[PDB]
Write an enzyme that holds these catalytic residues in place. Structure first.
Site, PDB file in Angstrom:
ATOM      1  N   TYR C  54       0.812  -1.235   0.000  1.00  0.00           N
ATOM      2  CA  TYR C  54       0.000   0.000   0.000  1.00  0.00           C
ATOM      3  C   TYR C  54       0.837   1.273   0.000  1.00  0.00           C
ATOM      4  O   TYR C  54       1.791   1.406   0.758  1.00  0.00           O
ATOM      5  CB  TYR C  54      -1.028   0.074   1.140  1.00  0.00           C
ATOM      6  CG  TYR C  54      -1.594   1.491   1.290  1.00  0.00           C
ATOM      7  CD1 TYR C  54      -2.561   1.991   0.369  1.00  0.00           C
ATOM      8  CD2 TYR C  54      -1.134   2.353   2.297  1.00  0.00           C
ATOM      9  CE1 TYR C  54      -3.071   3.286   0.467  1.00  0.00           C
ATOM     10  CE2 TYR C  54      -1.647   3.659   2.417  1.00  0.00           C
ATOM     11  CZ  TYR C  54      -2.617   4.111   1.488  1.00  0.00           C
ATOM     12  OH  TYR C  54      -3.142   5.375   1.596  1.00  0.00           O
ATOM     13  N   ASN C 196       3.009   9.958   7.000  1.00  0.00           N
ATOM     14  CA  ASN C 196       1.896   9.109   7.427  1.00  0.00           C
ATOM     15  C   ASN C 196       1.924   8.817   8.917  1.00  0.00           C
ATOM     16  O   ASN C 196       1.851   7.661   9.327  1.00  0.00           O
ATOM     17  CB  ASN C 196       1.922   7.792   6.642  1.00  0.00           C
ATOM     18  CG  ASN C 196       0.593   7.050   6.650  1.00  0.00           C
ATOM     19  OD1 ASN C 196       0.534   5.894   6.228  1.00  0.00           O
ATOM     20  ND2 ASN C 196      -0.474   7.704   7.096  1.00  0.00           N
ATOM     21  N   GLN C 284     -18.198  27.448  58.403  1.00  0.00           N
ATOM     22  CA  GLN C 284     -17.288  26.889  57.383  1.00  0.00           C
ATOM     23  C   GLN C 284     -16.976  27.859  56.231  1.00  0.00           C
ATOM     24  O   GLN C 284     -17.731  28.774  55.948  1.00  0.00           O
ATOM     25  CB  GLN C 284     -17.837  25.586  56.786  1.00  0.00           C
ATOM     26  CG  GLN C 284     -18.416  24.615  57.765  1.00  0.00           C
ATOM     27  CD  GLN C 284     -19.011  23.428  57.082  1.00  0.00           C
ATOM     28  OE1 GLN C 284     -20.023  23.537  56.400  1.00  0.00           O
ATOM     29  NE2 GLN C 284     -18.391  22.282  57.251  1.00  0.00           N
ATOM     30  N   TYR C 287     -17.698  26.480  49.534  1.00  0.00           N
ATOM     31  CA  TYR C 287     -17.225  25.350  48.723  1.00  0.00           C
ATOM     32  C   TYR C 287     -15.979  25.635  47.901  1.00  0.00           C
ATOM     33  O   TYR C 287     -15.061  24.810  47.904  1.00  0.00           O
ATOM     34  CB  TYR C 287     -18.337  24.816  47.809  1.00  0.00           C
ATOM     35  CG  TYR C 287     -19.449  24.034  48.520  1.00  0.00           C
ATOM     36  CD1 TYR C 287     -19.615  24.099  49.898  1.00  0.00           C
ATOM     37  CD2 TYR C 287     -20.357  23.270  47.788  1.00  0.00           C
ATOM     38  CE1 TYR C 287     -20.639  23.419  50.516  1.00  0.00           C
ATOM     39  CE2 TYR C 287     -21.367  22.597  48.401  1.00  0.00           C
ATOM     40  CZ  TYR C 287     -21.500  22.662  49.771  1.00  0.00           C
ATOM     41  OH  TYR C 287     -22.511  21.958  50.398  1.00  0.00           O
ATOM     42  N   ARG C 290     -13.300  24.972  50.583  1.00  0.00           N
ATOM     43  CA  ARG C 290     -13.432  23.735  51.350  1.00  0.00           C
ATOM     44  C   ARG C 290     -13.514  22.489  50.486  1.00  0.00           C
ATOM     45  O   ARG C 290     -13.064  21.425  50.920  1.00  0.00           O
ATOM     46  CB  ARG C 290     -14.637  23.850  52.315  1.00  0.00           C
ATOM     47  CG  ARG C 290     -14.965  22.616  53.132  1.00  0.00           C
ATOM     48  CD  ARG C 290     -15.824  22.963  54.363  1.00  0.00           C
ATOM     49  NE  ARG C 290     -16.969  23.764  53.968  1.00  0.00           N
ATOM     50  CZ  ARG C 290     -18.181  23.293  53.688  1.00  0.00           C
ATOM     51  NH1 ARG C 290     -18.444  21.990  53.748  1.00  0.00           N
ATOM     52  NH2 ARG C 290     -19.139  24.143  53.324  1.00  0.00           N
ATOM     53  N   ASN C 320       2.309   3.508   8.126  1.00  0.00           N
ATOM     54  CA  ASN C 320       1.694   2.376   7.501  1.00  0.00           C
ATOM     55  C   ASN C 320       2.178   2.452   6.041  1.00  0.00           C
ATOM     56  O   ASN C 320       2.240   3.541   5.467  1.00  0.00           O
ATOM     57  CB  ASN C 320       0.163   2.488   7.614  1.00  0.00           C
ATOM     58  CG  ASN C 320      -0.566   1.419   6.832  1.00  0.00           C
ATOM     59  OD1 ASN C 320      -0.360   0.219   7.051  1.00  0.00           O
ATOM     60  ND2 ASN C 320      -1.433   1.844   5.906  1.00  0.00           N
ATOM     61  N   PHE C 336      -1.592   5.484  12.222  1.00  0.00           N
ATOM     62  CA  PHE C 336      -1.627   6.890  11.881  1.00  0.00           C
ATOM     63  C   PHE C 336      -2.838   7.590  12.487  1.00  0.00           C
ATOM     64  O   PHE C 336      -2.931   8.811  12.425  1.00  0.00           O
ATOM     65  CB  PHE C 336      -1.668   7.035  10.369  1.00  0.00           C
ATOM     66  CG  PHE C 336      -2.666   6.154   9.725  1.00  0.00           C
ATOM     67  CD1 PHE C 336      -4.023   6.519   9.707  1.00  0.00           C
ATOM     68  CD2 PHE C 336      -2.277   4.956   9.148  1.00  0.00           C
ATOM     69  CE1 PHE C 336      -4.985   5.703   9.118  1.00  0.00           C
ATOM     70  CE2 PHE C 336      -3.227   4.127   8.547  1.00  0.00           C
ATOM     71  CZ  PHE C 336      -4.603   4.518   8.519  1.00  0.00           C
ATOM     72  N   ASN C 424     -13.179   6.589   2.378  1.00  0.00           N
ATOM     73  CA  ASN C 424     -12.179   5.640   2.850  1.00  0.00           C
ATOM     74  C   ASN C 424     -11.909   5.874   4.341  1.00  0.00           C
ATOM     75  O   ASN C 424     -11.811   4.943   5.134  1.00  0.00           O
ATOM     76  CB  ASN C 424     -10.855   5.823   2.071  1.00  0.00           C
ATOM     77  CG  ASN C 424      -9.776   4.826   2.508  1.00  0.00           C
ATOM     78  OD1 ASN C 424     -10.030   3.623   2.551  1.00  0.00           O
ATOM     79  ND2 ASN C 424      -8.577   5.327   2.838  1.00  0.00           N
TER      80      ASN C 424
END
Lengths: 536, 536, 538
Positions: C54, C196, C284, C287, C290, C320, C336, C424
């Site tokens: 290929y 590639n 306290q 958030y 804490r 490839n 790839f 493809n």
């Protein structure tokens, strides 16, 4: 059978109890029980002394500047249940609630929550007797509000709290009369200890990851059926390719595809490295075949990462304040914030959408004679009857589910409101709705995978016909995909035969009942699930 | 009562028939009926001659290269129903199906679809007798598959097609026996004419826009309650400000707020342009009050734009091929693509999330003493009882719904699959799932608005107490918001009184049943809806 | 200095080469050079024998059913550079092009590509001479087209391929003349082996991870300074709490906060379990403070996950076909596909948005006297001048960047086109635009954090004033945040003094210049970045 208090719970443990009714038991280990009693002692003594503790001798949230006297310390906790009775929407599925209660019991056994053993046993009891409190889908920014329905039901606070008692709806007081249990009165901290945690969201998320793992393994089996239907090659999964790009997920995916494809008659067997020209076809398989392990790697890997994080969340003390009896102290902390859950679910949905979309690409190849390597258009069965359009409708339906899964792959943890509850909860996880959205994604992905299974099965039959002159693919498939193909055909009630493929004429079945039957078999852990159990 | 064939249908017409059971009738106008017969004639003659027409003498989709003989022309259509029997998921609500059938009948009356009047009457009949075919939430990429359940049920094709007959489930053949109707056999084109359109998605979308319009008007009423609870000013809505920035939506919003706020005792009345210093407060109201009409304008405007587009879609011929009897011709077209629906619903969801989020900002001001201009924290009722946290839980629940609405405001029409059905449907609308997602957003926004109504109502009472020494806000509100406040209090079953505000002690109500009762009143077009009917 | 081919490359190694011009060498390991030779000889042989392979004796992608014969095998590789010369948009930063060549050289050393050592050496030479090919931001769905500009430049194929040669734009044939290098002809497969892989997107991504690890450390330092400024407590960070919820990330976040805050005089030191009523204020911390270790846990942990995956992708063979010389075979496969890079970058942008939103909520606390615990409105300095509004415009600017970070936190991997390249490439990763998108996130984050740092420095000056009656926070801060504090004041050129805080009057500085100067220092790995050196190797 599942013991609570000793060893860490697994997602599988959670799932057995939630779905399968697996019995549960508190450990009898006296160090564990001492721990539970010690923190209880500690909180009792602290309130006796009028000492400042959050949500004990103080108001809740942005009203933690309201001090609360020793004499209103109990009532404080009982009122916590009332003002948190503001759920809305649909109900959680009963299995997510079973999961919640199991996790809460697990949390409490660690001896840092200051709760009576008797309140922890109430959950053991509800679990074993099949009593499931009703919890609503709305109310938590990540689980005070959902957990108040659990608590009020456990203590039989009011007839307004409903439950499922093995399939029957009734009120919680009535359920406790039936179980020969007396109503309970919350002691200081105990309301908070019942309600101040991540047990529900983590509960929902535990079952999502369980179901997603399974569907991934089924999806793998689907691709293997696709590669065969397509006369693709096994070369793509050759260990040489993947050892040189050694992500764990990609190494696992390619190696599992080798096992799946092994001894198949329908695959191009080319682990030797043969690859001659083909016509009219391209010399290589398209990306959906060839890059399968590279594509799936991060998905497989992420689902593991999330599984690992949920398992820690499930075995966490998730509550505030935490009693440290060894130092005779309490600490104001933030373990109630379910960030791993809110973000892990955003991740889980995103991956599910990525799995669906890859699978849908495999279907597009199958249905299209330009790309199917010689299969009939839409995988029609009986070409002597020209009105057959085969799976055209089944494809369109799959084309309608997949976009939605990617839509659900959008995130929610970044959409938190910074103005939440009096501006006190200025960061929050959205973990609870993230988790219910994740459950939505899994329920829909189950119907999606069913459709993909149908394409695969029909496709191999039609490839078998090209190869042998008949439609009985079972001897032409690899032994691993033959198990799954024959599980699917068992569920749908169509037996493989040489003179007929799965779908011959269109007017011969409702494809909808097959989707339904397959989704329900997957959901129940049936024979389709068992057919891929070696992958899990 | 609603006549089909004559004048264009409105969203309101659609809603009356869908939800309220409003009777329906085909026009008797002979030009209309001639049209219907003429196209019928035309198609019959064309098939007699073996002439090439899409989906008549041809296969469907990417199999439109399969020619189909005159002798298989009927069967072709009957098979179309079968292979499209591949729906999944939950069922559509019955009102969306009623809407679908009404639209399909409307489409057909235009005389370009080549369908027997008798098939159009079948829908008139089902509509009037209260027979509602089951349609699944999945199968359309935008409505062949959902519409095949409608058709197969209308013609009693098979016991596998189910229906609702006034609240009872039964099979379609059985329903036709009960109605004293015979099963029908589809003629060429008629299957396609039954199934090749946008009637369902548009049906769902018609009812969404209806419900959204209403909820917008309720939301307006909520803000008006908020501005009063806050002792905000009416100056922001002064016509001089908005005439100089004259977007229609902003001009409408500010002018409606003037009407809403008129003659209120609780508002700062400053249309004269007075604005002296205040302490400790800022000289101006915050943005959620002051920019309300600028913020809401594009929302109001977009919902109108969408309403306008849905109304054209509802009165469109939506089908392929279209018969032109005047030229004795047929055309292959694309009117089945529901792009206005797919995109209008993406828009509708996005706006709903923007409405929710603005409302939630009004609640954050109400609950927070730093910003409430002197109201108790979380709008607690009884301050002599220190355990009361008031609406703390109701806020958190609202904080959990709103992020989700913005999540649902993400789009879906851009997520279309280009590989759909054999690569033939390379563009598609995703209009059907967009529309069901929109229905989700509206169902949830209904619970959201209920919560916002609760905040408003409680808040004015507590502002009334600051003003007068009592809790009966009715004489202190503007007459327009007093209607809505008293509709809400009627629905929830708590009567306004001078010694008690809506919520006094936490343990005195389940806030969940109030959410539920209010959402259900809104859904049913009850007294809360009627209270703002002058805005619509 | 950085030897290629021997041991695995780290993200630190890549960053040093890309950004710091660290020198590079190919290993002289004889087994490594033998492998490179063997695959080279394998391709030579296979091709002259007429073997079908290929992109060597075919036919690329959707046209892989074109048989091409050995007589055309060379001209196939050369024409691959030409038809890929279709980049568009802006150009990559030169540092990501350097990373891209580092990784491609690294890939080739592994011996499965059948490429001439001389072409791998050509990349070494470009890196060390500081010659960088221009590469464009569009052309890859995840890196043929971008790598074609690298290839085209390396071999000096044509004057239209442009490079940066130590600051001057130049065509590529001119740069090879200056190097005294001859133009090269690509043999069969060499062009594909050159183009590639995942080198560019993974290059871009490796620099992103590096910059985010750094900005995470700074962020922590910012939170520690906010905690001090707001008189928050250290009790949230107690090991007992986090040992009972033992997520690795949250343990690490909690433990680093204990270190960052150690020996501060602006915290309430309550690791003994002490928690009195405040007046009249909440028992306290909110958030944002804490639940900090719980909120940062998944983020820390996720950035580590990504970093691990990118370090595997950096060291992987991505082309490839793959030559297996031991069995004298080539395999057609898919390395790839940069899927880890596309989804990882998706995740990275998401995490950055989440870090930003938390920081902006802390700024909200500092600027607002309802929640600042006694600091002045908008962190104003000179209260005697009534027209001052302190850092009010600076918060608005932060409020305009944070939502845009969360917007970029959206994903792109899930938006792949299924009809790509003649149908493809029906799956692809979008990893190149994903990492491109992450660079934009990181760059914007560096600006946001500078704003965050400025709010923190000012606020501890004002808190110290609260405590002690002067504006020098140096003595009152924990040693660990003193370093960072001083490093920021140094960078903007306004010294700590007992008389004055960082920002006194509005008209005394352009805040925009301070943002620009801090941003540049972080980007450059300067004193602000050295100040949080300790947090980094952990």
């Amino acid at each position: 059978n599942v013991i609570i208090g000793n060893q860490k719970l697994t997602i599988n443990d959670v799932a057995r109890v939630a779905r399968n009714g697996t019995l549960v038991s508190l450990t009898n280990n006296t160090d564990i029980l001492q721990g539970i009693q010690a923190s209880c002692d500690y909180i009792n003594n602290a309130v006796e002394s009028g000492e400042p503790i959050y949500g004990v001798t103080s108001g809740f949230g942005g009203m933690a500047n309201v001090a609360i006297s020793r004499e209103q310390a109990s009532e404080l906790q009982t009122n916590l249940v009332w003002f948190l009775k503001t759920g809305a929407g649909n109900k959680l599925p009963l299995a997510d609630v079973r999961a919640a209660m199991l996790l809460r019991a697990n949390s409490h056994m660690r001896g840092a929550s200051g709760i009576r053993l008797e309140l922890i046993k109430r959950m053991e009891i509800f679990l074993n007797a099949g009593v499931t409190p009703y919890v609503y889908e709305f109310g938590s920014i990540g689980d005070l509000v959902p957990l108040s329905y659990i608590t009020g039901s456990l203590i039989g606070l009011d007839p307004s709290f409903k439950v499922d008692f093995n399939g029957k709806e009734m009120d919680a007081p009535t359920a406790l009369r039936q179980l020969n249990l007396s109503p309970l009165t919350l002691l200081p901290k105990e309301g908070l200890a019942m309600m101040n945690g991540t047990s529900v969201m983590t509960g929902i998320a535990a079952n999502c990851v369980y179901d997603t793992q399974i569907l991934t393994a089924i999806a793998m089996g689907v691709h293997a059926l696709d590669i065969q239907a397509l006369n693709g090659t096994n070369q793509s999964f050759h260990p040489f390719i993947h050892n040189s790009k050694p992500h764990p997920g990609q190494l696992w995916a390619a190696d599992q595809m080798i096992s799946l494809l092994a001894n198949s008659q329908l695959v191009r067997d080319e682990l030797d490295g043969k690859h001659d020209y083909r016509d009219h076809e391209l010399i290589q398989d398209r990306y959906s075949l060839r890059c399968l392990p590279q594509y799936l790697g991060p998905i497989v890997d992420g689902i593991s990462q999330i599984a690992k994080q949920i398992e820690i969340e499930i075995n966490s003390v998730t509550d505030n304040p935490l009693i440290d009896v060894d130092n005779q102290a309490s600490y104001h902390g933030g373990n109630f914030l379910g960030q791993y859950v809110g973000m892990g679910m955003d991740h889980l949905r995103y991956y599910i959408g990525l799995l669906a979309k890859h699978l849908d690409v495999q279907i597009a190849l199958l249905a299209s004679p330009e790309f199917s390597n010689g299969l009939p258009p839409s995988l029609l069965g009986n070409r002597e009857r020209k009105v057959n359009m085969g799976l055209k409708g089944l494809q369109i339906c799959g084309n309608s589910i997949m976009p939605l899964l990617t839509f659900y792959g959008n995130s929610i943890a970044d959409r938190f409101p910074t103005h939440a509850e009096q501006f006190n909860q200025n960061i929050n996880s959205q973990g609870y709705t993230s988790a219910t959205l994740a459950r939505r994604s899994v329920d829909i992905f189950q119907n999606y995978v069913a459709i993909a299974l149908m394409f695969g099965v029909q496709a191999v039959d039609l490839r078998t016909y090209k190869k042998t002159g008949h439609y009985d693919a079972r001897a032409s498939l690899s032994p691993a995909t033959e198990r799954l193909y024959s599980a699917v055909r068992h569920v749908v009630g169509q037996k493989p035969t040489s003179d007929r493929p799965y779908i011959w004429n269109d007017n011969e079945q409702g494809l909808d009942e097959h989707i339904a039957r397959i989704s329900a078999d997957i959901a129940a852990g049936g024979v389709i699930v068992q057919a891929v159990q070696d992958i899990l």
